[PDB]
Amino acid sequence: HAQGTFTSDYSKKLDARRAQDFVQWLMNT
């Protein structure tokens, strides 16, 4: 889907939604 808006418009989320919640615990121990 959105083969034209599924990549570019997908580089400003995981790297903050899959990194924040993550790196949020990784550094909590």
Ligand SMILES: *C(=O)CC[C@H](NC(=O)CC[C@H](NC(=O)CCCCCCCCCCCCCCC)C(=O)O)C(=O)O
């Ligand atoms: C996020 O779900 C994908 C959104 C992304 N594009 C944008 O961030 C901007 C367009 C808009 N996005 C938003 O406003 C935020 C949407 C959040 C919805 C989250 C629901 C859960 C889905 C999780 C999917 C896995 C993604 C990795 C997260 C660990 C929009 O939604 O269109 C895009 O590429 O669509």
